Design a protein around this ligand. Structure first.
Ligand SMILES: Cc1cc2nc3c(=O)[nH]c(=O)nc-3n(C[C@H](O)[C@H](O)[C@H](O)COP(=O)(O)OP(=O)(O)OC[C@H]3O[C@@H](n4cnc5c(N)ncnc54)[C@H](O)[C@@H]3O)c2cc1C
Length: 385
């Protein structure tokens, strides 16, 4: 009755936790030496002391009811974050007024006022993390918390409860269905055998040519409409507690914010998120990272950034175990194609943020997807027996 789960992100850990509770025997393969995947919490030293920062996923939003259930069971608390003018809203209203096609095709229909149109384009590109020329126009249609002590405390606790079932330092390279039943999971070192497997790997990993996973023409047809969002997290220390804030940069395609932690004080950390691959390339975070600090300092003259400060950068696009930040939708995504993506191929099931139909791309979606896959696996094992 052996189940193999590939990836110890929220999707894989949620699948494994539900299967463990059902009394099944699970093994979780994780390439990193930590759980959580794109949930990754660390501390940043500042002149006021050390503060938790989110190098990946940050905000728990309204409606994250599966994650809230898990936080309750693992004893973890949510902390309120405490967080040109309006012309972008009106311009987006005119935009809608004019859901087929791409956002850019709709922006092209607006009166040709380029700085204002580009301000709206930037808002779209930051949040969808893709070019406006590729994302569905339906994205134009579109209070917060963080986990006390770091969002990664949740996957940390889920993994800890699975104990020796979680196998770190294991890089999956192939997954093969066997005709008479069962699955072979091959890492860089050796192969294991399972009755069923849940692939809970990133979108970019399951589409990577360096891995041999089960595929079908129907899946390939649905996957081609799922875009890879790209984003980088950036953090700077501050010399004193600021007000809470949220301030966007049009030219840089990034957002900055300052937020309260469990103490009730606003942490002296400038948090930042840059979205869309062309923005990250224009920023040149790897080569000349003082440039972005200079831009951030100019954007946020109200914040006291030390003069010799260097940004902490987390460019998930360059991590072969992530390959981007989250999924986005091209115009051609359908509910039926999205549903297809979680159906098994042989005895190989699937979970991840990219196949969630409502909370697409979010921590809540990864959890919900993992828990759906666990339910499908339990039906398959009931069948095999
Ligand atoms: C910068 C950034 C900001 C975000 N902001 C938010 C936010 O504010 N709120 C929100 O809800 N969501 C946000 N997210 C999205 C959220 O991080 C994801 O939806 C979610 O964490 C994805 O979980 P997953 O389990 O699907 O994938 P992952 O977390 O990527 O887990 C997949 C796992 O597979 C492992 N792995 C990869 N390749 C292999 C291999 N070959 N063999 C074995 N293991 C392998 C990885 O190491 C990883 O542990 C953000 C993401 C990023 C990157």
């Amino acid at each position: 009755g052996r189940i193999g789960i590939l990836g110890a992100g929220l999707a894989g850990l949620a699948a494994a936790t539900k299967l463990a509770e059902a009394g099944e025997n699970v093994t979780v393969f994780e390439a990193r030496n930590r759980p959580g995947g794109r949930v990754w919490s660390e501390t940043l030293d500042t002149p006021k002391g050390s503060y938790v920062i989110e190098r990946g996923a940050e905000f728990v939003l309204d409606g994250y009811t599966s994650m809230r259930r898990l936080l309750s069971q693992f004893g973890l608390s949510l902390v309120d974050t405490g967080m040109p003018g309006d012309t972008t809203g009106i311009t987006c209203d005119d935009i809608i007024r004019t859901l087929q096609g791409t956002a850019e095709e709709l922006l092209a229909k607006l009166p040709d006022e380029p700085e204002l149109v580009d301000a709206l384009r930037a808002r779209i590109e930051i949040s969808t993390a893709v070019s406006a020329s590729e994302v569905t126009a339906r994205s134009l249609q579109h209070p917060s918390w963080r986990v006390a002590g770091g969002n990664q405390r949740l996957p940390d606790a889920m993994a800890a409860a699975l104990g020796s079932a979680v196998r770190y330092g294991e890089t999956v390279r192939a997954v093969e269905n066997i005709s008479d039943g069962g699955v072979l999971v091959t890492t860089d070192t050796d192969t294991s055998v399972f009755d069923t497997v849940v692939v809970a790997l990133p979108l970019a990993v399951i589409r990577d040519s360096q891995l041999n996973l089960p595929t079908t023409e129907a899946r390939d047809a649905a996957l081609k409409h799922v875009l890879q969002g790209h984003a980088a997290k950036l953090h700077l220390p501050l010399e004193t507690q600021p007000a809470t804030s949220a301030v966007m940069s049009v030219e840089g395609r990034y957002w900055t914010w300052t937020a309260t932690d469990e103490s009730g004080a606003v942490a002296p950390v400038l948090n930042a998120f840059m979205g869309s691959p062309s923005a990250i390339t224009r920023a040149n975070l790897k080569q000349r990272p003082a440039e972005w600090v200079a831009k951030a300092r100019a954007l946020r003259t109200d914040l006291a950034i030390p003069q010799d400060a260097a940004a902490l950068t987390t460019v998930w696009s360059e991590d072969q175990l992530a390959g981007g930040a989250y999924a986005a939708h091209a115009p051609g995504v359908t509910a039926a194609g999205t549903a297809l993506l979680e159906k098994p191929v042989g005895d190989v099931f699937w979970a991840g943020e990219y196949s969630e139909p409502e909370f697409v791309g979010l921590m809540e979606g990864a959890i919900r997807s993992g828990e759906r896959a666990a339910g499908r696996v339990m039906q398959r094992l009931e069948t095999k027996s």
